[PDB]
Amino acid sequence: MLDRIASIKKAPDEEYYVPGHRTCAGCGPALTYRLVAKAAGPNTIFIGPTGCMYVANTSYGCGPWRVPWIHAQITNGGAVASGIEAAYKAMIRKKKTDAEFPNIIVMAGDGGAVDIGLQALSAMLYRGHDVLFICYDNESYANTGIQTSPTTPYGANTTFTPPGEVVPEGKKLFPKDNPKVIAHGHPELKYVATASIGWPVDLMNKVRKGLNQEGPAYIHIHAPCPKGWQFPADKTIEMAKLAVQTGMFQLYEYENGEYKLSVKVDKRKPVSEYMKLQKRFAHLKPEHIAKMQAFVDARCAEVGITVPVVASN
């Protein structure tokens, strides 16, 4: 069993995601991978559906994982992990390997988890494989040059949703909420949580709680992208914290039909205090910001964040 981590000072020293990878300076998903790898430990197999955390990390002909890792299509992350799990189950049962049963972890991008990889994720949960499926959400198809995905917020500028006089907000669609999509209707699902690199001990503990379950788990991790969102490389953690503080991202665990909120404070900041720091929102007018606020308010109510919205200054 993987133990709860009490604090940063009591966090593990060992790194299983080592220096050396072609990820942006300040890359949120890179930090996500580091913390997940730290939490998972050495008895772990990683599955990498195509995206930044595959391409950026293996450029070129190498990699930063101390543990085994395999490339998956962006379409089949859940299915590839299903097969690795089935193999280990069968090989161990049929006495054809003396290897121990490993942690099996999918590191899908938001594209590979909520859009083009969803069907394979849902099926893996349906079949009940002992696998942890992670979405590292940078809110676009990032490696292809930043294009709208279903987790891309309303009003965000991407190369597929540029603002213009016909479509002033750039993106008119509000995002799909994947952790809630898969949290219902899958009887074998043992654990669902949202995490954020802003809260790194909380993140690692959620990963360990997911791995500790005998059956499938889904963790959706917010991972700000300074390239794609257009903010300075040293503001990635501030952005992550503000996402949660404004309710743009909700942090929780969902179990037995109930939401356990991970960060509980007496107020919520207005979304503008988050959006104005990112040039992906630079084009938006007050009426657009108001639509975002109303949406976020509804999202917070859904998980039971009922504190008032209060400007910082």
Partner: protein, 394 residues
């Protein structure tokens, strides 16, 4: 061993059972479904111990066994028709990662519209993927190819996936006599699967990193070399299969009455057995006709065909497929046979016959008409159009 009157579906399932496969991923589509129904019974009745994974579709099936193969399991899956094309994306990753996945294909005409009848079109869409590929024309051969292809594909000189193809309905459903091997024979023939890479935390590897631009051509050429090495390993496998099981297969061409034949029909699968029966009857009329059934489609036996089939006055190539827009307007076999026999193009007349479209039977009478056309070509030395679509044109 025991002889039973079983469908090609059940024959394949026995081959899979005998190979003691570790992971199977299922999904339904006529006419291959029966393979997975029998394997599912085999698992539930304890005749085979394997993970039987309910795939959510064919893309997933291929993806599941990709993952399982990388973890060291011997794997099996299969499909038909649009199931083959839905899984298209995954075939190249499997080949390129040198994972010897075996996929059974019971052929079925591609949409549209819905049509359960067979064409080889579906599996032929996969001809570039870097896989071993061939058509069984009987249930016996469907079982036997299952074993042979695991042997060849899993050989550490090869490590390539295989498409074990069999005609939809004509082989998959129609019952035929099958000699089922016993466990001792298979154990002598088929070593346990061992790859050069595997997912194992005790010996950690990074499988499929983004390679640098300059390394593209060497990675492609490396796999090309593996592909070019298949034939020698297949020849050895057929030799061992003869010694162990008592059935001798030609690695490339199943020839019937070709020694003294003036004209032959070349093609693959169950309909070639019909061709043999028609040839035998025409021989009674005095016609020197013959049949060459292609056993191995990939990698294509170019030089073997060039050497063994260049002695005929005319070759009619049956394509049981709709390879639209292809050079010479027959099907794929006509183009590739002509490519192989190119040096002899002035002397060896070739023409293409497209038939069995949509799963229609290629009748004795239709083969009669093909042979009659080849007789004329042999006499005249003229090919007037390079292909005939039967029964509209011939």
């Amino acid at each position: 061993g025991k002889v039973r009157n079983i469908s090609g579906c059940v024959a394949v399932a026995h081959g899979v059972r005998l190979a003691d496969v570790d992971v199977i991923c299922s999904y339904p589509i006529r006419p291959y479904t029966g393979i997975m129904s029998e394997l599912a019974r085999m698992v539930a009745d304890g005749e085979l111990d394997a993970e039987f994974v309910h795939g959510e579709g064919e893309h997933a099936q291929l993806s599941v066994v990709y993952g399982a193969s990388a973890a060291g399991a011997r794997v099996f899956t299969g499909s038909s028709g649009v199931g083959v094309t839905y899984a298209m994306e995954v075939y190249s990753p499997i080949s390129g990662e040198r994972l010897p996945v075996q996929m059974a294909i019971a052929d079925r005409t591609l949409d549209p519209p819905g049509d359960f009848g067979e064409e080889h079109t579906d599996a032929e869409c996969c001809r570039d993927q870097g896989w071993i590929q061939g058509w069984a024309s009987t249930p016996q051969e469907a079982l036997d190819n299952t074993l042979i292809y695991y042997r060849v594909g899993e050989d550490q000189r090869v490590l390539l996936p295989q498409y074990a193809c069999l005609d939809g309905y004509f082989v998959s459903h129609i019952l035929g006599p099958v000699d089922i091997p016993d466990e001792a024979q298979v154990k002598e023939f088929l070593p346990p699967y061992k790859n050069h890479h595997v997912l194992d935390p005790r010996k950690p590897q990074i499988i499929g990193p983004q390679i640098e631009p300059a390394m593209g051509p060497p990675l492609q050429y490396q796999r090309y070399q593996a592909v070019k090495g298949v034939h020698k390993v297949l020849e050895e496998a057929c030799d061992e299969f003869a010694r162990i099981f008592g059935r001798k297969y030609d690695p490339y061409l199943d020839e019937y009455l070709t020694d003294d034949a003036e004209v032959i029909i070349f093609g693959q699968g169950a309909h070639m057995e019909t061709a043999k029966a028609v040839a035998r009857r025409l021989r009674n009329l005095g016609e020197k006709v013959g049949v060459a059934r292609l056993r191995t489609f990939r990698p294509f036996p170019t030089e073997q065909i060039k050497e063994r089939l260049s002695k005929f006055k005319a070759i009619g190539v049956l394509d049981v497929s709709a390879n639209f827009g292809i050079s010479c307007s027959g099907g794929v076999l006509l183009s590739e046979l002509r490519a192989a026999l190119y040096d002899y193009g002035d002397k060896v007349k070739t023409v293409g016959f497209v038939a069995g479209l949509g799963g229609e039977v290629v009748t004795h009478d239709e083969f009669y008409r093909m042979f009659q056309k080849l007789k004329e070509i042999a006499k005249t030395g003229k090919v007037e159009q390079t292909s005939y679509w039967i029964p509209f044109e011939l």
